[model samples]
Target chain A: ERPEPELIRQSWRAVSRSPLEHGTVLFARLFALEPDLLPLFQYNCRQFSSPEDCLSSPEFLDHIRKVMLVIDAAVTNVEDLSSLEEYLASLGRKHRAVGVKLSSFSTVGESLLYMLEKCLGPAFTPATRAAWSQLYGAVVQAMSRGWD
Target chain B: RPEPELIRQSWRAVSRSPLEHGTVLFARLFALEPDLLPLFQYNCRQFSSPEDCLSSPEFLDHIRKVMLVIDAAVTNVEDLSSLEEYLASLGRKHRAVGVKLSSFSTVGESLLYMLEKCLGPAFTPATRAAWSQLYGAVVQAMSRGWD
Candidate 1:
């Protein structure tokens, strides 16, 4: 079964209520675990050379804006597989500039953890986690690069 | 809409260019409701007064937007609340553009006919019911506050 709608709905609340906080925290959590990944955000702060520098850089901030919306689409199209597939295909195209693939959404899954881990309490009950993301993982698996 | 039978999915295998598919759809629409052709005033290249817009580039673009919306509504029939909110917004916009409720009925008939031709044996009764419900939900919302 997918996420019991309440948790999925809660997952919705956590992000919608504090999108800016969610975006920064998502990057923060992912960076804390994998400092080397900061090079990825280096697309922005080529001069500064630190996660902190890029985190505030226009490049990284812009990336956050582009990315968090993409992640939110998962929630928006959760039930509609047809649109969801179309959306993810477009996502693959967007990320292609940065060299990502269908399966590469795993990094997003990691980033989502902080958004949830930080306020999972307010959004979800003791359900603990989302079977929701299991389906989302399957969703990422199904997406292709701007295909018909 | 709920992933039609295997035989039906087979109907979707046509790999025509975007405009080609639009050609097939509008062909049916014009055949059923020639009057509606005039409403497509946006595509002047196709509508030079009593002309066929079917092959015009403008018609293809117009039909693309309409077809994709119908496709989304039909497939996402299960997601009622979101679908309703979406169509309500869509409805209000269409109202601003001078669309009549009567035209919705005309398009509904043509769409079902098109689906039948495209799906062949796969367009089952259940599929029809699901489509009808979705059409009702979406168009009824669009037609709200009609004059």
Candidate 2:
């Protein structure tokens, strides 16, 4: 009966209608916005690469999908804050190992929101925006636990 | 023997990809092994563009089912009896369709190439070793029903 959860659920349903073809929309935008994050990726990090090369790599599809799957989990489980805390904490720790700065979540969050807005134009209403932000806040707070 | 820890982690990472991930996987899969395409009448229908083919609902559904089965193997690697039952079932279905063990082997190679490209710096030595064994188990179990 929670308004926030209801709104978030509906928003996600709307997104299901216009799905990505391997989550490249988000990652493509992510690297576009956060160019520094590029080198952390396999294609970019491994060598002989140009910026164009990273986006076109077959791995980009897989990595973007992994990124979204993680996000999708957070989206589904947002209602149960208790269940997501450790997961986000571990996520923070994992990203840290992969060279993502804890502070970088701020940029990543911005990029994600922007991409969601772009992909789900109608669903990006005030109601869904609030739900999305609240959900992101909960996840970020949990991620903070292991960010160091 | 169990699959290596790194392979499990890496495969888990790949399998948990976004909804569109399957689109990309199969798109590249077909491209990697074009001959595999004729098997799916769906693959040849106006599939001029990779994006067009990968994003279609029919294609997504096909890959989704396959990805789900692959995921089952990764998660239930420790549960061999159940895993065997599942793979044996798949083997039966695939055999009915005339799928060969080498065909599955080709799939593993294709996926490896894609995963390496996608996971880039992350597909470390440990992951490579693990994936080899992990896919080995999948093919072995899946082919068990061929007899």
Candidate 3:
């Protein structure tokens, strides 16, 4: 059977609205399960004061939204590589400045997928899940190129 | 004692090259230092690789020029408030991206110290000796901003 386009679109919107928000939640789950990695994000939350603060902050939250919009535009206009390239270059510089390691991205991906399974419940059908997988794959590919 | 024009020109050339080259050397030095915390291994290796990073004598020389420029920039800049702003922004962005402050500057300082030690006798008394002082000045300026 073919994939449902509307389902894909809706799921993508949800995923895009809060990649970091989703990331925080997913990492929280992992910390609960593993307990060892708890140290990683424990003090990290203090940077924003509260989860509500992080989600509400205009500056930081807007930055997250802007990143998502860029990713969406890149996927929609795959043929137009310039914007994507420029976006990735800026992202690379930012990531490099922050000392974001590639390995940590993988951990983020794992935690994200785990969270999707937990949150989506019955909505997480194989097709719907695969759509997200492809979308994330593109995101990772674009980001990796930028980082390089 | 050197001509100001000569110093400025030399520094300009160094600044342009070092922006890229210094990063390459810093990554390589970080990889070699075992005591340092491994923040990102593959990325570190990417910079360390000959194919991806400083591959030729020309590239290394360019990087050296850049380091010299950074030194000059530090020495010549009368007001370093702008530098401080840049570092604070860097700190905020890094924190957002999950990089601990400890991992960033400490490792960089160690790399500078290591480079100074490793380039020992060859760096004595002449060109390399003066260069080291310039390099130290730049590092010190940057460290101050971070603090």
Candidate 4:
């Protein structure tokens, strides 16, 4: 009944083909969007000096994998996200407990869109972007429930 | 009769002891509707009683989670529209799980009962009425998912 869900799934199919590579691009764009978020991922209590160091860390790479997996879950459940609501809320709660500001997610959303644009190239139409935006917005709203 | 000040002032007292107050709300809810207990499943185990459900650590986390939702509502009392979609999302979840719309009425009563117990004599008629208006608006916002 809606074009947006199919558009979202179609766009994600390209990005999911190479999650790690594209997820790396996502985080690269993320760090470019907000370098300060770099310190938030201190593996084994050891902080990296720069985005390059952090990006190359094996632990950070795993974190990128985890992020992509969550996105995969979102795309899988795009039509009816109610099933993922509590889980996303708990994920947000953990992030908040670890000192991630809720506002930082908007930056992640931007980075996600940037990665889609890079991966999809000419295929990344306004419709695809808007569909992803709507899906991502719903995810963040569920997550925001974790905050006071 | 949208008493934002009254709502905020009343909530401030309960927010300080959110778990304690939220426990009261859930307790009252179960008393009113015992069948709702099994809906709160954790790790493939069904709670045997309201007592068992209330005491579980995971259940307590949910109690706090619910309190946080109320806290958000209070924070945005003047502009509840900000929380409209979120509430609808919540409503969608409940409906997806086969929860009846009428159950929300029991929840509303339980919430008011919890506030009354927490606020004691301070829970005046005006405050109760104000909360009904606020909670009513919230329920209406959430009830939109029935479509």
Best of the candidates, TM-score? 4
- Interface RMSD for every prediction, one decimal? 9.7, 11.2, 15.2, 9.9
Per-model TM-score of chain B: 0.71, 0.77, 0.40, 0.88
In model 1, the clashing pairs are none
- For model 4, the stretches where C-alpha displacement exceeds 4 angstroms are A1-77, A80-148, B41-51
Model 2 misplacement above 4 A: A1-3, A44-49, B1-147
Deviation of model 2 at B125, angstroms: 22
Among incorrect, acceptable, medium and high, the docking class of model 4 is incorrect
Which candidate number maximizes DockQ?
2
lDDT per residue (tens digit) for residues B53-140 in model 4:
5577657756765776677678668767655656676676568767889988998999999999888999999999989988888888
Ordered list by DockQ, greatest first: 2, 1, 4, 3
Minimum summed lDDT over a 10-residue window in model 2 chain A is located at A15-24
Q: How many Å off is the CA of A29 in candidate 1? A: 1.9
| Candidate 1 chain B worst ten-residue window by lDDT | B7-16
Better of 3 and 4 by DockQ: 4
Supply candidate 4's per-residue lDDT for B133: 85
In the order shown, the chain A TM-scores of the predictions are: 0.73, 0.82, 0.57, 0.91
List model 3 lDDT by residue over A1-148, tens digit each: 2234566656656665446576456656654555444333333344533443433443333334344444444444343333344445445545555566655556656665787776677878888787656555555555666466
What is the lDDT for B96 in model 4? 78
Q: Order of candidates by TM-score, top first?
A: 4, 2, 1, 3
Reference-based lDDT, each prediction: 0.58, 0.65, 0.48, 0.77
